[PDB]
Amino acid sequence: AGKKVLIVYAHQEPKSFNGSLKNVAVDELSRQGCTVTVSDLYAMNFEPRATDKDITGTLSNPEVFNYGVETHEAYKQRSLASDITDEQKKVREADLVIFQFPLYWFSVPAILKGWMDRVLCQGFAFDIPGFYDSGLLQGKLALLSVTTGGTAEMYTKTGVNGDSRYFLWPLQHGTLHFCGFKVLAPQISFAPEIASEEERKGMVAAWSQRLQTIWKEEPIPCTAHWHFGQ
Amino acid sequence: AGKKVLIVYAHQEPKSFNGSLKNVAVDELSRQGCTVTVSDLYAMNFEPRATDKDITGTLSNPEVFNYGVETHEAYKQRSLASDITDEQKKVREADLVIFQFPLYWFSVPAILKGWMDRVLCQGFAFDIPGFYDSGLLQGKLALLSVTTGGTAEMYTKTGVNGDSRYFLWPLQHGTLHFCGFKVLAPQISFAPEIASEEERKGMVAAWSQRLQTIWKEEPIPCTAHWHFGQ
Numbered sequence: 001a002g003k004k005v006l007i008v009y010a011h012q013e014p015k016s017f018n019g020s021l022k023n024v025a026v027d028e029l030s031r032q033g034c035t036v037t038v039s040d041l042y043a044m045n046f047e048p049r050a051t052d053k054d055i056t057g058t059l060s061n062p063e064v065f066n067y068g069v070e071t072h073e074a075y076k077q078r079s080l081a082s083d084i085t086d087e088q089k090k091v092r093e094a095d096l097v098i099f100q101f102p103l104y105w106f107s108v109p110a111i112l113k114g115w116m117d118r119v120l121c122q123g124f125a126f127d128i129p130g131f132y133d134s135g136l137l138q139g140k141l142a143l144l145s146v147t148t149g150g151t152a153e154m155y156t157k158t159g160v161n162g163d164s165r166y167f168l169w170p171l172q173h174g175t176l177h178f179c180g181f182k183v184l185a186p187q188i189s190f191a192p193e194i195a196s197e198e199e200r201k202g203m204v205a206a207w208s209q210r211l212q213t214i215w216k217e218e219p220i221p222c223t224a225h226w227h228f229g230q
Numbered sequence: 231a232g233k234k235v236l237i238v239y240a241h242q243e244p245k246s247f248n249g250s251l252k253n254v255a256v257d258e259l260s261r262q263g264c265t266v267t268v269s270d271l272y273a274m275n276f277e278p279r280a281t282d283k284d285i286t287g288t289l290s291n292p293e294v295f296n297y298g299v300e301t302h303e304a305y306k307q308r309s310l311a312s313d314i315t316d317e318q319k320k321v322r323e324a325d326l327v328i329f330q331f332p333l334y335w336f337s338v339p340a341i342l343k344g345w346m347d348r349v350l351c352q353g354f355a356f357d358i359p360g361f362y363d364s365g366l367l368q369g370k371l372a373l374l375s376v377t378t379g380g381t382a383e384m385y386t387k388t389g390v391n392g393d394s395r396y397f398l399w400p401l402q403h404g405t406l407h408f409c410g411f412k413v414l415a416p417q418i419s420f421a422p423e424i425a426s427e428e429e430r431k432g433m434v435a436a437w438s439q440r441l442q443t444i445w446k447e448e449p450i451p452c453t454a455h456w457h458f459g460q
């Protein structure tokens with residue numbers, strides 16, 4: 001019954017364009033009766049570093065630290081840091097995970113990258129036995145809501161930065177799809193700083209308009225063809 | 231003449247394959263008479279998060295905080311956090327910058343992504359205009375030395391992960407080249423964890439061997455065709 005939604009927000013300013021898109025997602029999804037949880041990473045001062053402090057108690061090898069094996073063991077032994085576990089709890093219960101963030105070097109901001117590095121550990125998000133279409137998070141929907149600095153023009157197959165689908169690869173396919181996520185079509189708000197009040201008001205409008213039928217949307221075919229192909 | 235190289239290291243275990251590759255570069259370049267410097271991010275507990283704490287002076291817009299704008303203005307006014315300016319000092323005098331890290335979700339670890347987000351600020355690494363071939367860091371060489379869990383086979387066009395050059399796009403083009411860096415062919419040491427004891431020694435030997443003639447190398451054609459083809 002009903003749907004649960006987690007929004008991983010990554011911006012320092014509540015009055016930013018990102019903040020508005022995030023508030024619009026909450027308003028709409030909340031008006032729809034959906035269950036909404038938000039992770040304000042900056043506000044939570046979320047630990048981005050993948051260290052040995054992510055494992056509580058004794059390590060399975062205090063001689064040579066291997067973050068990948070340690071977390072897998074910590075997860076299976078329920079001994080991960082509480083901040084990491086608190087997040088996995090939200091992801092486990094979610095039906096739709098929305099990532100709201102400004103583009104930082106063709107990728108997500110470091111605080112957001114830390115999230116994925118620490119929260120999506122082996123055993124919870126994936127495992128040798130099953131990744132991609134066999135990820136441990138299959139059945140869940142993922143969506144990237146990103147804002148850029150460069151104009152949509154610059155993000156064309158013949159533009160300077162190249163086609164936006166290029167930088168989406170490491171995120172949609174390499175991460176989301178890898179964990180079994182049904183990646184939805186990204187929502188990109190091109191150069192909101194450059195745009196005007198009219199244009200900006202219009203961007204946030206399309207965001208909310210789309211949020212009315214996201215449960216109706218079809219998962220994007222996360223393939224090498226979709227991103228780079230033609 | 232002499233040369234200065236900066237290795238931005240990002241691994242927690244000094245005994246890891248990455249740590250070995252890092253000590254190797256340090257030994258080889260150093261043997262050649264080169265000026266080397268290592269930025270062991272984890273050992274420095276490097277701040278990955280981009281926040282208002284990176285600016286010391288008065289904020290241009292104390293009402294709405296904008297990291298990009300604030301760090302640009304702070305850089306010109308010399309009001310950036312010392313940990314940030316200390317890194318820019320290293321990059322500035324560097325002829326070659328090598329990034330030593332294990333692949334994390336088709337990208338760099340959060341701690342290393344934070345370095346790119348905070349260190350390569352507007353005014354220092356690039357300007358608008360003044361990016362890509364016009365980058366402020368033009369005349370410098372940059373190299374990505376990545377180690378992964380996946381195998382070379384998995385990282386092929388028809389592989390489960392796609393060609394390894396795909397995930398190198400945001401980093402080589404979107405980041406380094408954007409900053410004016412001449413990108414040298416990446417050094418990828420595939421699945422050293424699965425490789426045999428001899429194959430591991432083989433991957434290390436190939437590293438130090440390539441470094442012996444690194445200065446005679448030429449940058450790759452950092453273009454969409456080089457990465458994807460088409």
Ligand SMILES: Cc1cc2nc3c(=O)[nH]c(=O)nc-3n(C[C@H](O)[C@H](O)[C@H](O)COP(=O)(O)OP(=O)(O)OC[C@H]3O[C@@H](n4cnc5c(N)ncnc54)[C@H](O)[C@@H]3O)c2cc1C
Nearest residue numbers: 016017018020102103104105106147148149150192200298
């Ligand atoms: C370290 C770093 C790396 C970066 N890397 C890249 C990169 O690789 N590629 C790239 O393209 N860009 C990059 N950028 C730029 C970045 O993507 C943009 O600055 C950012 O996405 C702008 O979004 P914002 O939310 O910060 O904008 P804002 O600063 O919020 O500006 C947008 C405008 O929206 C207005 N606004 C707020 N709420 C509303 C509302 N409800 N209705 C109408 N208007 C509203 C604001 O007041 C403001 O004037 C980078 C920036 C930094 C700091």
Ligand SMILES: Cc1cc2nc3c(=O)[nH]c(=O)nc-3n(C[C@H](O)[C@H](O)[C@H](O)COP(=O)(O)OP(=O)(O)OC[C@H]3O[C@@H](n4cnc5c(N)ncnc54)[C@H](O)[C@@H]3O)c2cc1C
Nearest residue numbers: 068246247248250332333334335336377378379380422430
């Ligand atoms: C959060 C997270 C996300 C990840 N995402 C991805 C991803 O998207 N794609 C992907 O492919 N992988 C991914 N990985 C896996 C990661 O890239 C590999 O685990 C890592 O690159 C292995 O390098 P290492 O230095 O950590 O190995 P090590 O743990 O050091 O193991 C390699 C072996 O090398 C041996 N060794 C070290 N030095 C020497 C030497 N001098 N001579 C001989 N043998 C030596 C070691 O003792 C060890 O047995 C991820 C891992 C984590 C933790």
Ligand SMILES: CN1C[C@@H](O)C2=CC(=O)C(=O)C=C21
Nearest residue numbers: 105148149150298299352358
């Ligand atoms: C801060 N800012 C404004 C925006 O124009 C922009 C584009 C980039 O590619 C980048 O690295 C930084 C940017």
Ligand SMILES: CN1C[C@@H](O)C2=CC(=O)C(=O)C=C21
Nearest residue numbers: 068122178335378379380381
């Ligand atoms: C630790 N490990 C094993 C290696 O096979 C691997 C590939 C990934 O894509 C990933 O996220 C984690 C991995």
Ligand SMILES: [Zn+2]
Nearest residue numbers: 173177222223
């Ligand atoms: Zn995919």
Ligand SMILES: [Zn+2]
Nearest residue numbers: 403407452453
């Ligand atoms: Zn390029």
